[PDB]
Symmetry: C2
Subunit: 249 residues, 2 copies
């Protein structure tokens, strides 16, 4: 049986004061009857208004990135600043940061370990590109990603870790992942965790699907054996995120 | 003589809610008798708090970085988000972003042009490393950096632009810039702007000193013909920043 599901909203680099206020108001008025942890990952600029306006008992707030420590890093936000700011969840290693902003397997791993050490809950992202998948390298690429993370964690740290699998290979390329393709990837990840870190860790670990999800396909995805929720992109800026939440029943 | 001076506080990746609150209170309580534009560049997280609490009429708020466009750039903040948030000043091209976060001369130039196009006042940072200076390339590097920015600007855009010269060769290297070395760098920049953009633009341009300062040497630095103020790092998290403001009278 599954651990507690998670419905995470990755707003990415998006939003206005008005549009996210209206979104938060919808979230606040939504009845959620089952046990699910909901997460809103806003831009740094919008954390203050999200802290103030978001009140639903099943929602927490997350950052989309950080660096490990404060100092002479103009433009960046550190873990201690987020902690001082009351933000205790964080998304790390997003495919966009791996692609655009120099985050190697090892850089992601150090950020994840630093965030767990500071007391964060971490949604750590992995996932293979279209070249990697077609070339038959899905397993080695995705499991190398998570192994790099695992090499920097104690067994106890996995209690604070959530995995989001991003099927980068489908996004923007014109592909759409089937629930069986998603389940195949999640089962591969969980089997590696079971073998290399422990069956007990693997049974408790939440693995979120991070491809394109809507209110329709989310229920069918969550029915799969190794899907513990969603790390949602574009749909999390829209009212249908509510239906994605309800799909984790 | 000189155009209006600027005293900018680059807080870099630093600050708690309490410690920055106490700093803003000090700024709010400071009497500033001369014409100077003071600027507070906080982390993205602290922008809301600074907007609410900063009240001194000679102060504005700035961001430390941005990307040009909203979209699928997890972890980043865009210029439309900052503009929507009421932030109208921005530091771009800081040496730490050029070193750590992939910002080439061209990437800095594109960010500066996008910010100028969006209405921002921009503090665009240039300056050479110790290795560049020691190999005799101070002038080549500084002029290459500003030429790349100028390439993406029209003459009228310079009204929105401020240049900050960072003696990166003196940033934790063991070296210390003298006022004569700063002035030579500032004069070189002025000379290029006058010859390539216009003598009118050059006379109106603010070229800020972005190396280490205290009250005493800031007063000496402001005596130099081509220094129009300061883009301060570590002193700007301290009460001493008020003495740097005073050094521009």
């Amino acid at each position: 049986s599954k651990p507690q599901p998670i419905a995470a909203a990755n707003w990415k680099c998006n939003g206005s004061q008005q549009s996210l206020s209206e979104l938060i108001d919808l979230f606040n008025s939504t009845s959620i009857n089952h046990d699910v942890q909901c997460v809103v990952a806003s831009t740094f600029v919008h954390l203050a208004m999200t802290k103030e306006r978001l009140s639903h008992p099943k929602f927490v707030i997350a950052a989309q990135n950080a660096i490990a420590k404060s100092g002479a890093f103009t433009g960046e936000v550190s873990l201690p600043i987020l902690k001082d700011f009351g933000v205790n969840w964080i998304v790390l290693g997003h495919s966009e940061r791996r692609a655009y902003y120099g985050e190697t397997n090892e850089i992601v791993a150090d950020k994840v370990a630093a965030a767990v050490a500071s007391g964060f809950m971490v949604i750590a992202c992995i996932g293979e590109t279209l070249q990697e998948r077609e070339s038959g390298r899905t397993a080695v690429v995705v499991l190398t990603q998570i192994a790099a993370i695992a090499k920097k964690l104690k067994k106890a740290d996995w209690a604070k870790v959530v995995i989001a699998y991003e099927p980068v290979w489908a996004a923007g390329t014109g592909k759409v992942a089937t629930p069986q393709q998603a389940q195949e990837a999640h089962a591969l990840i969980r089997s590696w965790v079971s073998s290399k870190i422990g069956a007990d860790v693997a049974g408790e670990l939440r693995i979120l699907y991070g491809g394109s999800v809507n209110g329709k396909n989310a229920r069918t995805l969550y029915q799969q054996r190794d899907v513990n929720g969603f790390a949602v992109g574009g749909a999390s800026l829209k009212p249908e995120f509510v239906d994605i939440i309800k799909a984790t029943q």
